[PDB]
Amino acid sequence: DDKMKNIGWMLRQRATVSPRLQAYVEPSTDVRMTYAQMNALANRCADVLTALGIAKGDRVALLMPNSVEFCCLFYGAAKLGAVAVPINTRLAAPEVSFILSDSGSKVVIYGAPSAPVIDAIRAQADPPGTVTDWIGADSLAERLRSAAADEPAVECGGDDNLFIMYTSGHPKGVVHTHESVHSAASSWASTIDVRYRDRLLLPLPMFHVAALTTVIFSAMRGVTLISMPQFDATKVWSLIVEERVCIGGAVPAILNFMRQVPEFAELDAPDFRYFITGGAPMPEALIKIYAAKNIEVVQGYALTESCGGGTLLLSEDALRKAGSAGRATMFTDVAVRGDDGVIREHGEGEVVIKSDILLKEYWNRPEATRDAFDNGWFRTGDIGEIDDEGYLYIKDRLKDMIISGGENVYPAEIESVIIGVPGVSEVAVIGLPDEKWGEIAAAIVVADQNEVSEQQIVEYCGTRLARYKLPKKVIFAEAIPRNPTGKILKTVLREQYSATVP
Numbered sequence: 085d086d087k088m089k090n091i092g093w094m095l096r097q098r099a100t101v102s103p104r105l106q107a108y109v110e111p112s113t114d115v116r117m118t119y120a121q122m123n124a125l126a127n128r129c130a131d132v133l134t135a136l137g138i139a140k141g142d143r144v145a146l147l148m149p150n151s152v153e154f155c156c157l158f159y160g161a162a163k164l165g166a167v168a169v170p171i172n173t174r175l176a177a178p179e180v181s182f183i184l185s186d187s188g189s190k191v192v193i194y195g196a197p198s199a200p201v202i203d204a205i206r207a208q209a210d211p212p213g214t215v216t217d218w219i220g221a222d223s224l225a226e227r228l229r230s231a232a233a234d235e236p237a238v239e240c241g242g243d244d245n246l247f248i249m250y251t252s253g254h255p256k257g258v259v260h261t262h263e264s265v266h267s268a269a270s271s272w273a274s275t276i277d278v279r280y281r282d283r284l285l286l287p288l289p290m291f292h293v294a295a296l297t298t299v300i301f302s303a304m305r306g307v308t309l310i311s312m313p314q315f316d317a318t319k320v321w322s323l324i325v326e327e328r329v330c331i332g333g334a335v336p337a338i339l340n341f342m343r344q345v346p347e348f349a350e351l352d353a354p355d356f357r358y359f360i361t362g363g364a365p366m367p368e369a370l371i372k373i374y375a376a377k378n379i380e381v382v383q384g385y386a387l388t389e390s391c392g393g394g395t396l397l398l399s400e401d402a403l404r405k406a407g408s409a410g411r412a413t414m415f416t417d418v419a420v421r422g423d424d425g426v427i428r429e430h431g432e433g434e435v436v437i438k439s440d441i442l443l444k445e446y447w448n449r450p451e452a453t454r455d456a457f458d459n460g461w462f463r464t465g466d467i468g469e470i471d472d473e474g475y476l477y478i479k480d481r482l483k484d485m486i487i488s489g490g491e492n493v494y495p496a497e498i499e500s501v502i503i504g505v506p507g508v509s510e511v512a513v514i515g516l517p518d519e520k521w522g523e524i525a526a527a528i529v530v531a532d533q534n535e536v537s538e539q540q541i542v543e544y545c546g547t548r549l550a551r552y553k554l555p556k557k558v559i560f561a562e563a564i565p566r567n568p569t570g571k572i573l574k575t576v577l578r579e580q581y582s583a584t585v586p
């Protein structure tokens with residue numbers, strides 16, 4: 085009986101071990117709920133979904149702000165064997181319409197901030213045809229008020245589908261199961277220093293895979309979620325103090341802003357131990373200033389396809405291994421697949437993952453699914469290097485890969501050669517559109533133009549790189565666009581140089 089492997093039943097079990105432990109605290113909306121209350125609201129959510137015709141395998145799209153309803157809808161769907169489709173509320177109406185059609189969502193639950201997108205979608209001549217119900221905030225709240233908190237007969241779990249999350253032309257839907265979600269939650273919970281009764285600040289959207297995994301591992305470990313649905317750097321330290329927060333989810337921008345507000349210098353947070361951050365590596369200067377406040381930083385690497393698991397750079401290693409994405413986590417194997425097709429745990433190549441945290445499939449894309457795997461190893465499309473001690477360094481992401489005359493070219497391959505040229509101080513490589521090649525690799529170079537010439541860089545590149553990998557344009561710039569935490573902004577580069585191509 086797969087109920088024992090059901091994420092919604094897991095919540096019920098946390099509500100049995102620790103019924104009176106705080107589960108969800110959102111001071112902005114005055115929500116302070118125990119695990120027993122959260123389980124009861126999940127049951128009410130399940131009752132509401134049942135009432136709407138949702139059965140095992142049916143998709144319920146979620147387009148709403150962070151809230152305990154978001155969590156309990158997810159849990160409620162889990163108990164029913166339904167499949168949640170959490171949608172990014174920043175997407176425009178055509179992208180949301182695609183997702184609804186592709187997922188074949190039956191019910192759409194939307195927040196008030198998303199009413200304009202839903203309105204635009206429902207106004208189409210032929211809206212997504214599978215949607216039988218569009219349920220906004222007021223309707224959901226009224227339904228919840230009259231629902232019974234009966235525990236559903238839960239008879240699904242394990243490898244049963246649980247959610248579809250879209251990742252990007254058109255996105256693909258990444259299908260996760262009760263098993264993958266549980267594995268990812270276990271992976272985090274067994275790898276990071278998380279403790280029974282820890283209080284964890286979530287100030288990132290719940291439609292991001294890592295935030296979803298955070299919600300689930302919180303129930304798994306008995307952690308209280310402290311919710312900040314709209315991040316405000318001028319309000320976050322107060323919240324961290326008032327709610328005795330132990331761990332916080334963040335990204336480097338957030339931690340940078342949090343360092344600049346008056347509260348950083350002024351409030352003391354003795355219970356706060358570390359942030360878990362996603363995104364580019366944290367700058368050393370930021371790691372150090374947080375370390376002076378006795379706060380550590382955990383970093384890592386994950387994808388939608390890995391349910392937010394993958395590698396973690398533990399606190400002890402943040403400075404030691406600046407720029408690393410860390411080591412493989414519990415329940416995850418991570419390696420690199422060479423140009424030769426050999427998978428190795430040490431060296432350079434395409435990052436590959438083998439783990440129960442992996443997606444079951446891309447939704448209604450069986451060939452894409454097969455092509456993404458090599459003997460159980462998921463091919464990320466990202467390139468990196470694993471050092472002799474097992475630390476992963478990401479070199480380039482799939483999103484920045486260039487297809488030039490049908491050949492794949494990653495920018496880091498070129499950047500790491502050109503940065504070597506004497507007189508070059510910085511280099512970033514992007515693809516620019518091209519009638520002939522589709523995209524060409526353009527090197528944007530900051531250099532002493534008295535010492536360095538375009539011809540010299542290209543003829544120098546011709547020394548280390550196959551001919552098809554040579555930059556087809558070299559562009560000298562006085563500056564490359566970077567964010568305050570020092571990440572090269574390739575999206576800005578592409579915008580800047582759109583004026584140079586037809």
Ligand SMILES: N[C@@H](Cc1c[nH]c[nH+]1)C(=O)O
Nearest residue numbers: 089090091242262263266
């Ligand atoms: N080994 C089970 C454990 C589990 C899943 N969900 C809740 N518990 C699985 O991952 O499928």
